[PDB]
From a paper:
Bile salt hydrolases (BSHs) comprise a diverse family of microbial enzymes that catalyse critical BA transformation. Primary conjugated BAs synthesized in the liver, such as the tauro- and glycoconjugates of cholic acid (TCA, GCA), are deconjugated by BSHs to generate cholic acid (CA) (BA names and abbreviations are summarized in Supplementary Fig. 1).
To examine the molecular foundations of BSH substrate specificity, we determined the crystal structures of six of the Lactobacillaceae BSHs examined above: four glycine-preferring (LgasBSHb, LaciBSHa, LingBSH, LreuBSH) and two taurine-preferring (LgasBSHa, LjohBSHc) BSHs. We examined the sequences of these loops and found that taurine-preferring enzymes exclusively contained G-V/T-G (‘G-X-G’) motifs, while glycine-preferring enzymes solely contained S-R-G/S (‘S-R-X’) motifs. While activity with MCBAs is relatively low compared with conventional BAs, some BSHs such as LingBSH and LreuBSH exhibit appreciable activity. To examine the recalcitrance of MCBAs more broadly, we monitored the deconjugation kinetics of 5 BSHs that had previously exhibited assorted substrate preferences (LingBSH, LgasBSHa, LgasBSHb, LjohBSHc and LreuBSH).
Numbering used by the authors:
A (entry chain A), B (entry chain A), C (entry chain A), D (entry chain A): 2 to 326
The structure:
Amino acid sequence: CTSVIYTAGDYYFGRNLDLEVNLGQEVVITPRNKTLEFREMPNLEHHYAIIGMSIVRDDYPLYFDGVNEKGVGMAGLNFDGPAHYFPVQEGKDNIASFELVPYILAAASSVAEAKKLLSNANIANINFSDKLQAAPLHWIIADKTGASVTVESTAKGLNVYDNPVGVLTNNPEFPRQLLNLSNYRSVAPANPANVFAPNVDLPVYSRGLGTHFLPGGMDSESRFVKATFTKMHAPVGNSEVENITNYFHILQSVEQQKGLDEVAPNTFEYTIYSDGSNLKKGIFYYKTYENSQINAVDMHKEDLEASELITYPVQNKQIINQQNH
Amino acid sequence: CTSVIYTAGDYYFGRNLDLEVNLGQEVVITPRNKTLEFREMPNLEHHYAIIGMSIVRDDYPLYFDGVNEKGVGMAGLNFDGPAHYFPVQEGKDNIASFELVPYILAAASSVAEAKKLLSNANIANINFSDKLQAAPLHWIIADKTGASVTVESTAKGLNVYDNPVGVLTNNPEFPRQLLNLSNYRSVAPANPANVFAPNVDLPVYSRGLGTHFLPGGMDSESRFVKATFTKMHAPVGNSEVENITNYFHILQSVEQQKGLDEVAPNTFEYTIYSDGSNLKKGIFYYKTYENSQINAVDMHKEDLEASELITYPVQNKQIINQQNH
Amino acid sequence: CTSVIYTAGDYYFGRNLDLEVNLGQEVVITPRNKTLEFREMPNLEHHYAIIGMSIVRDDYPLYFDGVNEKGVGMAGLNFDGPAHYFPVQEGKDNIASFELVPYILAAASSVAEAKKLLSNANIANINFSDKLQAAPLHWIIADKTGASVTVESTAKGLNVYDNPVGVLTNNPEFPRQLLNLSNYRSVAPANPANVFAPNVDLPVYSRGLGTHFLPGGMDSESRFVKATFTKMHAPVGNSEVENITNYFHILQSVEQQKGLDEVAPNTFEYTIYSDGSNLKKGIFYYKTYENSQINAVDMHKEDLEASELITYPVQNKQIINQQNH
Amino acid sequence: CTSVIYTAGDYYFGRNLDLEVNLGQEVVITPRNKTLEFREMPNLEHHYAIIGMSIVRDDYPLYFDGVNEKGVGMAGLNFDGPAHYFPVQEGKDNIASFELVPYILAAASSVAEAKKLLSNANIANINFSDKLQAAPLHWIIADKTGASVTVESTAKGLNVYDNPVGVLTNNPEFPRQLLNLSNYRSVAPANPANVFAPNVDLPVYSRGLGTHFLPGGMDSESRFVKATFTKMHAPVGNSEVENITNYFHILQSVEQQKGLDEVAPNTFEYTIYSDGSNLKKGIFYYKTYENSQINAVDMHKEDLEASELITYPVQNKQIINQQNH
């Protein structure tokens, strides 16, 4: 998985979900008056409206990622190994891993408020059910000011790190992942000057040599570096349509194609979907691996004062424009 | 630019066109009875039908790439530096660089026949006009048997190389480009065994480490390696729609996003379009940078006995499916 | 800097010292009855004999690295950034950074005993003097059983990590440095099988392609990977002379040549000396950058019951064998 | 193998010889009046004096490399695959592969003269004997002006290329090897500015990050890049002793340690010797893998008017300075 905030125009947040099987994901709008229950905290009877990619069990929106009406975005990304959840702790705001995205998107109007909400929190080892055990995750939170943080619960406890690049992938822990970027300081979009052998003619035989050492692997560190470079050098678009076009090109740079990331015999981790939302306008856009046409769900076309989840199925059939006849 | 033959199903051939400006490209069908004039060879009054991406000047189809009705595909890719064209030579079949794609697609029913057509050929330094000077190019030819060759005219003369990987990008010359793949023999989709320090626990902290050293740069060598890996490990799809979906994912792996390959101030080489055709059925598919929906032009829905070029404009507006209302 | 334990024969421990200036280093033997004073712990009036590379101030052996008569080796390596020393703490064994190598080598007969000695320790922010301020360091301890640990005092406190590779360089912190080795699992001394494009002839045009992705940079991460590979694949020598020959070849693989690691204008970090000792026999061997002949100081040829430091100057003139006359 | 000219002081030329077995190499001086026989050219009864590393069969100096009294150096390096020798050709100066180094060093007073001597030459497929078949080689020639060329006989014929970097290793052919350096234009001794994410703090956590992408592998391309960087950034020494010290540090950067380059089970290509000569003074220096002390053979201490080969055995026992007693 790879999640980014693209800081152009209204600003755009979302993620690639990389996995070897589909999950039953659908587009879910949680309206302001849908009651959100929590295992160790008060229920939220009224809260911010949410739109995102989710599964639904027992009428609960188990979000993979989403954005709320106040311009806050959040995504949960696989974190298998470092992730550690703790027993319920007296005097701490105890949040199950499956509750964290619904809770923050319901309650926080900014990254700054999300930090306050997490300042006395504990990610508790609470399973949704016997069928759905807690999965190892970490999270990125971003908002329409451009701010973002990385939330990791590990053996050390709960850490909320400023995220200066607005990117997150999988392992390792965030300080290690961020430090690795320093190894790539010399990589650039423009052709490098010859500092290797300055008094020797070393012909520039190809365009693009500025990115000769840019990683293109399927692994988590490679994708973190390549996605950071791609988002940091993305254009400033003119329109909203240009900006969402540019956004998906960022995510596409670290898409995992089928066949390239083998996790078991005949089994490959690939980008099952890519989504991104306009943070100011609450428009959710997504593509699936099987359909290249972008789909848009505008949360404000719905009844955000409703009290039941509103859902749409992901359009996963390739829609080809038959241009001639 | 990157061109590939994807050897699944009916087999699929095409290219990314990477450039810093649009060219006026359109989809062009050359029917069997469109007369094709040649500067130093007999006119072809009747020939195979062609579909591809082209510009048109003086009613001549200046193809960037295309396929013909017999399942032969061909693409011209920038080759600035090594490319050399020669004066017209007595006793040689003299072909202008701008004529080579129209000529081979009109006259050859296989890569094998294309080899015979080139066995006494000379790529002549003939300009289309004073406005359109000859550009430095090399070419890949592929067919529905899976065969392919790389055609390069350099200071050494005209070389036609067997292409064992069915891929071509830009510089350097093909033997050098092919040899470079040997440096990547150890890169694989599956997780590598620990041969680095076999008696030490080196945890597999991420999926995808098989491709940790896979290049992700924008330059010609990086894209050649990454595209070869991606096509060599692409799935065998079930349907025609799955196969064209898989095909564009191959090309997408080496797409050049805006902002990453700077060629002059504020000027970036990016993938202006991607196309790919079913070699058996003569269906041409394409995307533009600005539109993620795939477009299809079926050559057999046209009058292939016509005598005038048939053209369609590239659909370059992002077509977003507005899912809710 | 790079420190290694070479697990062949009697076993051999030492380090490259990489710096941009000389330090006044000399070879120092601390005999059993040289009193070693400590700022916050009892003096050691009798202890194990030590030999190593050191400077001497106020008749105190400020060791960079050394080994003791019981087969324990220890080295202090620059750790600028992560290193943090704490105020003196009640109820903790408080050890100044400049005391740690003299103390462990004087008091510990094994890595296991060194772990016990550090189990309630605090690396205190105590300067040797106003002229010699505390420098940021971390340490490797190894012994003749092959065991080794990495000692780091950071903002987290004092950590003593099992060191499964018997190597240490500079930044970053040890868990991050060790995790990075997992990225190199596929690198090997033998030629790799073609898993990149298995059905394509990719000729093995050079020997040594197993190490094509082995780092050769001057930076701390590059040297950690290359030194680990080189020591892990070093031969098992026949004699003691062959083993010390093999040992220096390990250190030489990550030597920093003058001109390659620029730290300020005209200023280069280079390997000012390399040393290594037979852990069982207490023989200290060293080379300087300016002299390629190995020099040996056998600690047991000295009076190890003495009470004063015994010193030898480093032989830093190139001794060339004039073979003909 | 790796051969370099180090352009400091009097200038210094030589090579690492990398192989999996010893060859019986000795130091050989060919005096001016030693008759040199040639299979297809006139004998040289009088010629320039030569010193170098060689084997001797039938009183013929089969040089691996050497320098002559006029400041010309030459080395033969393995070139298995591209190397092609031709039948004896009428009207060409036909030179056996085993004769080329003795011939050029005997007859040429500069690289420019060596070019003239090769302008009508053919490297003929002539074996020294049935026991010593012709081995595949290419060659570097350098002189005390700093000039150098690369000599390759391949399927294309005989090519003599200007060598702008004064380095040669093994495969591939020289234009490909030289072009590969352009991929490393951004590698430098100084710390790189942050062009990757310019508005983000990417801490410089280690010195030496300028060379983070510098290759450290055992293969021919890796060693070519690393040796070129190391020689191009070597210091300008003060004395002759400093210069020969600096020279061996250049060769040491691409030494192949035992255990790292496996060519068959239990069989490793390693640097059996390293040599380098003062081009102006005709002093030959060498080390063996087993002996770190530099050895010097001054050709002018010999009778250069003699008519028989003068030989010295390589000092291959480690000479350790026993500093204490």
